[PDB]
Amino acid sequence: RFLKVKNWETDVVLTDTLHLKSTLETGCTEHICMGSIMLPTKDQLFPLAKEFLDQYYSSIKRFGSKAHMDRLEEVNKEIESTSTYQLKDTELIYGAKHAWRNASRCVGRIQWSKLQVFDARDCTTAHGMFNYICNHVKYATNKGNLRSAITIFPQRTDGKHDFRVWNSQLIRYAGYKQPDGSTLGDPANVQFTEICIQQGWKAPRGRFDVLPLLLQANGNDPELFQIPPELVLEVPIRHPKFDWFKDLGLKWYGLPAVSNMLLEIGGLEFSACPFSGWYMGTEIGVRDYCDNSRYNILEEVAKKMDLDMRKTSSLWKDQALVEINIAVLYSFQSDKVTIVDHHSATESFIKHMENEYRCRGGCPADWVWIVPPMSGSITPVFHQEMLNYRLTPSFEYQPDPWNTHVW
Amino acid sequence: RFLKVKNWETDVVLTDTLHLKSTLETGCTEHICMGSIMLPVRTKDQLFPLAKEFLDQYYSSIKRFGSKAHMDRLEEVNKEIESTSTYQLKDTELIYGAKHAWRNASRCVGRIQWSKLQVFDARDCTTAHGMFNYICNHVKYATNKGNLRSAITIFPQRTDGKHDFRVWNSQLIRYAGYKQPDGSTLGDPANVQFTEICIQQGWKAPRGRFDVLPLLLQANGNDPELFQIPPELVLEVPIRHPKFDWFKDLGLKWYGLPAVSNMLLEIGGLEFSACPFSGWYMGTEIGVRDYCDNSRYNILEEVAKKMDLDMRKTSSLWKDQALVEINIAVLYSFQSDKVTIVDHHSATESFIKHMENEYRCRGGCPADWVWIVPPMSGSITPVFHQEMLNYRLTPSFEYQPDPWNTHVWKG
Ligand code: HEM
Ligand code: HEM
Ligand SMILES: Cc1cc(N)nc(C[C@@H]2CNC[C@@H]2OCCNCC(F)(F)c2cc(F)cc(Cl)c2)c1
Ligand SMILES: Cc1cc(N)nc(C[C@@H]2CNC[C@@H]2OCCNCC(F)(F)c2cc(F)cc(Cl)c2)c1
Ligand SMILES: C[C@H](O)[C@H](O)[C@H]1CNc2nc(N)[nH]c(=O)c2N1
Numbered sequence: 001r002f003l004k005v006k007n008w009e010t011d012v013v014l015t016d017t018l019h020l021k022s023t024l025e026t027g028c029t030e031h032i033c034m035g036s037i038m039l040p041t042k043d044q045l046f047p048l049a050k051e052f053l054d055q056y057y058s059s060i061k062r063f064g065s066k067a068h069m070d071r072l073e074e075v076n077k078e079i080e081s082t083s084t085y086q087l088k089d090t091e092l093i094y095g096a097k098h099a100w101r102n103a104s105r106c107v108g109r110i111q112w113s114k115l116q117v118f119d120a121r122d123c124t125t126a127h128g129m130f131n132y133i134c135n136h137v138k139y140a141t142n143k144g145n146l147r148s149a150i151t152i153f154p155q156r157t158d159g160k161h162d163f164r165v166w167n168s169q170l171i172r173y174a175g176y177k178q179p180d181g182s183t184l185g186d187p188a189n190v191q192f193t194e195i196c197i198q199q200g201w202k203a204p205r206g207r208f209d210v211l212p213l214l215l216q217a218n219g220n221d222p223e224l225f226q227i228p229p230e231l232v233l234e235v236p237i238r239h240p241k242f243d244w245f246k247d248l249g250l251k252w253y254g255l256p257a258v259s260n261m262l263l264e265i266g267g268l269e270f271s272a273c274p275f276s277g278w279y280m281g282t283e284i285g286v287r288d289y290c291d292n293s294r295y296n297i298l299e300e301v302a303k304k305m306d307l308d309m310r311k312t313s314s315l316w317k318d319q320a321l322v323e324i325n326i327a328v329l330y331s332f333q334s335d336k337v338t339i340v341d342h343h344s345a346t347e348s349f350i351k352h353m354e355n356e357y358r359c360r361g362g363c364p365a366d367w368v369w370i371v372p373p374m375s376g377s378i379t380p381v382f383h384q385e386m387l388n389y390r391l392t393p394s395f396e397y398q399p400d401p402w403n404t405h406v407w
Numbered sequence: 408r409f410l411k412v413k414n415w416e417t418d419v420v421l422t423d424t425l426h427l428k429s430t431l432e433t434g435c436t437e438h439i440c441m442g443s444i445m446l447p448v449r450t451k452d453q454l455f456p457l458a459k460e461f462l463d464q465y466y467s468s469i470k471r472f473g474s475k476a477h478m479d480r481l482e483e484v485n486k487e488i489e490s491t492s493t494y495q496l497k498d499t500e501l502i503y504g505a506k507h508a509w510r511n512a513s514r515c516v517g518r519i520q521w522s523k524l525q526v527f528d529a530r531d532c533t534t535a536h537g538m539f540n541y542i543c544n545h546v547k548y549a550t551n552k553g554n555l556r557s558a559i560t561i562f563p564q565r566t567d568g569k570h571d572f573r574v575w576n577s578q579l580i581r582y583a584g585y586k587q588p589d590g591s592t593l594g595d596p597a598n599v600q601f602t603e604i605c606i607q608q609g610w611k612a613p614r615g616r617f618d619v620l621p622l623l624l625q626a627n628g629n630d631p632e633l634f635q636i637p638p639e640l641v642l643e644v645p646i647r648h649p650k651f652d653w654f655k656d657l658g659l660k661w662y663g664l665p666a667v668s669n670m671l672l673e674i675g676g677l678e679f680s681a682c683p684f685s686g687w688y689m690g691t692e693i694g695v696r697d698y699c700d701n702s703r704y705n706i707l708e709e710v711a712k713k714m715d716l717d718m719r720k721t722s723s724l725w726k727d728q729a730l731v732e733i734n735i736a737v738l739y740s741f742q743s744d745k746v747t748i749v750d751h752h753s754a755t756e757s758f759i760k761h762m763e764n765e766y767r768c769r770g771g772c773p774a775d776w777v778w779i780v781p782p783m784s785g786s787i788t789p790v791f792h793q794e795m796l797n798y799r800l801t802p803s804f805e806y807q808p809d810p811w812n813t814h815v816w817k818g
């Protein structure tokens with residue numbers, strides 16, 4: 001019931017109580033651990049609402065007070081009558097900040113309380129969604145000085161009227177499958193890029209074509225908009241020592257902004273809720289550039305470094321991987337665009353864990369996602385035991401709209 | 408029930424039915440995952456089921472399930488248990504058990520080799536001295552002048568838990584650690600407390616940076632005894648770098664033979680508390696963990712300091728740079744000396760091929776992702792992108808408490 005986590009490099013031991021207030025299910029049983037799997041009515045709604053409003057009034061040192069009871073009463077009357085309810089602004093802000101606080105896969109949660117929340121619940125059309133999103137992008141980007149933000153569109157109703165951003169991130173490069181069999185641009189986005197062109201996007205057919213936004217309002221068929229080019233901050237990738245690096249022609253965008261997730265607050269579901277912070281360097285330099293199914297650039301870089309590529313044991317992949325990452329960080333830093341390296345980010349997360357064990361009694365963390373994809377064991381998180389569990393308010397992953405939607 | 412795993416790089420999907428034969432618990436629940444937690448006397452009553460399950464597994468493997476030999480063996484074990492409260496494995500059963508414990512070891516990336524394992528039956532051993540001799544033979548056989556061969560030595564099983572055989576060392580070969588009055592450590596920090604016990608037991612410590620520890624061996628629940636492994640049996644590799652000639656001047660070496668001695672082998676309910684086993688190294692264990700953990704030899708700074716990296720900001724990735732070079736050195740060194748080593752690219756690709764083969768032929772392969780993914784270069788190895796299911800099959804190896812915490816000293 002009270003569980004220990006031990007750090008194997010420091011011997012520091014933390015006691016978790018927070019897990020007892022664990023809402024959802026992990027995917028694991030007593031018989032089988034699924035820790036590495038990517039995807040492991042009016043009745044239900046009121047306990048859900050009450051549970052949230054209880055943590056809310058608790059957080060503002062007002063538990064069991066008249067204002068608390070009053071609100072619980074009000075929301076109950078609204079549900080019985082309308083079959084749903086509306087969050088107060090303060091509740092909405094608190095809930096978004098907490099969905100981030102509870103994101104067990106996020107290493108950057110030291111920043112959780114600095115989240116600017118944009119209430120787009122009055123939005124009604126795709127063009128409105130677009131105006132809201134351009135504003136989110138410009139705000140968050142801040143000429144390179146990135147600020148965290150989320151924009152929250154209208155909540156689910158009968159489920160026939162959802163708002164969705166069809167893009168998985170607000171900003172991403174196009175992918176096209178080519179005559180000669182290989183892939184131009186980002187292979188991750190081949191499918192999406194095609195749905196855009198079939199919806200009428202005129203693709204430049206390049207390698208770093210910023211995709212158009214595909215926006216669904218009120219369960220309507222989605223529409224295409226180009227983000228204003230001057231809003232998309234991009235970074236040319238060079239190396240502080242390899243003059244030839246620039247010649248690969250690599251760029252990446254400054255703003256990471258996940259736009260396919262579902263925000264659940266007090267039982268209510270915000271299906272379109274694009275959010276953003278800033279990059280950890282390894283995301284671009286390890287995953288985006290080096291994943292085999294991504295830009296897959298290790299071979300080309302290794303070659304330019306003239307390494308021994310004939311045997312795996314010369315560790316040429318490993319050498320090239322590091323230089324690529326040095327270059328990502330160098331470039332962002334030189335262009336004064338916010339970026340964190342895996343060392344400083346994981347250091348921050350350990351500090352954040354300790355604060356959360358101290359102040360909150362725990363911190364849900366998913367070790368498989370928290371430990372960076374290169375240099376694991378030289379980051380502190382590697383040696384930190386973590387417990388993973390599902391708390392609410394939360395972000396949840398949801399089916400691609402094109403699977404669900406009918407035209 | 409069927410369970411599917413996906414590989415996110417290749418989109419291959421696999422179906423696990425084997426988890427249905429899972430016995431022990433994981434530590435996880437529907438409410439909590441403990442997947443990153445390191446550690447998440449019997450009676451007759453609980454023992455015959457365990458014996459039965461095992462012998463059923465053994466008799467299936469040889470295509471004799473249900474045969475008279477199978478039934479006679481069931482009755483004979485049954486009878487042995489009712490009459491003595493335990494039973495004795497046949498050689499063939501011991502071999503098969505010890506092989507399947509390795510096969511079922513979900514934290515082992517090396518398991519493609521599980522079927523080629525040399526089993527040494529040491530169930531006739533009675534004394535510590537006898538234990539030493541068995542262990543020297545194991546080491547010489549496994550080492551094989553650098554052409555390493557996997558092997559296990561199996562000492563007598565637990566009886567009443569008062570007469571346990573134990574190897575007090577966590578591995579047969581490891582370097583001493585000595586904690587200094589100034590708060591620094593000479594040698595391996597991991598081995599400090601164990602070095603202390605050894606010295607209290609009368610070991611004459613050389614007090615150098617790479618002193619091979621003496622075996623401390625417990626037979627039949629007796630107080631443990633010190634033995635020096637014959638140094639001509641301890642193969643060691645001096646560490647040098649192919650391009651950097653100052654690398655050798657750091658003074659580093661390592662032993663070639665990784666040999667885990669502190670684990671508990673369970674077969675058909677029987678508990679073998681001393682079953683030292685050995686394979687060969689994956690380079691990252693030495694290069695990443697042994698040399699670069701802050702709590703171990705911690706050499707990252709000296710290497711980067713000598714490489715003249717920019718060490719004033721983490722974002723220069725100086726630690727990452729030095730880490731690669733150290734790892735290049737260890738593989739280069741082992742290879743130049745003709746000591747068996749595998750790099751993590753090669754070992755994880757072999758593991759993926761083993762894992763798929765097992766799904767086809769066995770119906771699954773329990774694997775622990777947190778352990779199988781190498782401690783550097785995670786995502787450029789195929790295991791990173793591989794969904795895995797972790798569960799516990801027997802026979803199995805288990806962690807067991809260090810013996811100096813439990814031992815009743817007889818004086
Ligand atoms: C401010 C700097 C931030 C950093 C450095 C950061 C870091 C990261 C990283 C490295 C990941 C792993 C993602 C992946 O590998 O795809 C991640 C996942 C995630 N983070 Fe953050 N984060 C930041 C801000 C945010 C914000 C503002 C939110 C939401 C309000 C958020 C919520 C999440 C969620 C929900 C995931 C899991 C996404 C998924 O399952 O695909 N993070 N974070
Ligand atoms: C053939 C060469 C082998 C290689 C390259 C290999 C690879 C590895 C590696 C890299 C680990 C992680 C060790 C750590 O991080 O502490 C490991 C764990 C393990 N291996 Fe192997 N292995 C080999 C042979 C064997 C053999 C012969 C056995 C037993 C018969 C075995 C059973 C285990 C067990 C039980 C673990 C978990 C150890 C623990 O929980 O502390 N392996 N393997
Ligand atoms: C099937 C599936 C499930 C799931 N939960 N996530 C994914 C998305 C997969 C999971 N890792 C790769 C891909 O997403 C990349 C986007 N996520 C993080 C980010 F890059 F956008 C990001 C980074 C950062 F530093 C800050 C923020 Cl706010 C966002 C796929
Ligand atoms: C608390 C705890 C639990 C547990 N199950 N294991 C450990 C042992 C911990 C786990 N990593 C650090 C310490 O291992 C020392 C032995 N390392 C494995 C090996 F070197 F012996 C080895 C490597 C190889 F490739 C092949 C073999 Cl056969 C053996 C500690
Ligand atoms: C907390 C965590 O489980 C612990 O640091 C683990 C992580 N993964 C590991 N993986 C391997 N192969 N060996 C280890 O010692 C560890 N340590």
Ligand SMILES: C[C@H](O)[C@H](O)[C@H]1CNc2nc(N)[nH]c(=O)c2N1
Nearest residue numbers: 036037038368369791792793794
């Ligand atoms: C199968 C496995 O879960 C998958 O490869 C995961 C591993 N860890 C990850 N970690 C992060 N941060 N992001 C990811 O996309 C993944 N992918």
Ligand SMILES: [Zn+2]
Nearest residue numbers: 028033435440
């Ligand atoms: Zn689990």
